[PDB]
Design a protein around this ligand. Structure first.
Ligand code: 2BA
Lengths: 70, 71
């Protein structure tokens, strides 16, 4: 698998924009599924509680990010 | 999530930075496969001749990118 899904269930990251997010490693947000819509994420895209994040990167950082976010 | 592969066959864009690419649409480069390895693309990342660009986004702009990069 190369596309992983992570739930954004951490209140500490609400309204935090991708351009300021402190990534656990080399990761790109491929899509964010929010309110039944699939968004192509960019720098000023803000995380929201309940977001379904579709991410790609090495399993390590993905796992790392997963722990912090959900 | 649809991903599309685009070959970087246009020397016009070689060495150009992702932060400096003129995007005319809603698109993200999910992966670049370069020198037999699969890499995660960022702002500094350069397009290099022969790159296999894996992209996601508005299909209309994917199509324009394919014109620019591999036609
Ligand atoms: N995979 C990709 N596909 C297409 N273009 C790409 C790209 N990765 C980087 N870029 C382009 O480079 C900018 C520079 O990227 P950078 O990684 O330095 O700087 C970024 C980055 O760390 C964060 N960001 C934006 N989108 C992101 C994403 N999908 N995943 C992770 N971080 C993102 O916001 C900073 C400013 O974002 P902004 O989009 O307004 O500005 C973008 C975008 O035009």
């Amino acid at each position: 698998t190369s596309l992983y899904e992570i739930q954004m269930l951490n209140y500490k990251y609400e309204n935090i924009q991708l351009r300021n997010f402190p990534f656990g490693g080399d990761i790109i947000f491929v899509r964010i599924i929010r309110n039944n819509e699939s968004i192509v994420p960019h720098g000023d895209t803000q995380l929201r509680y309940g977001d379904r994040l579709i991410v790609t990167g090495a399993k390590e950082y993905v796992d790392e990010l997963k722990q912090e976010l959900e």
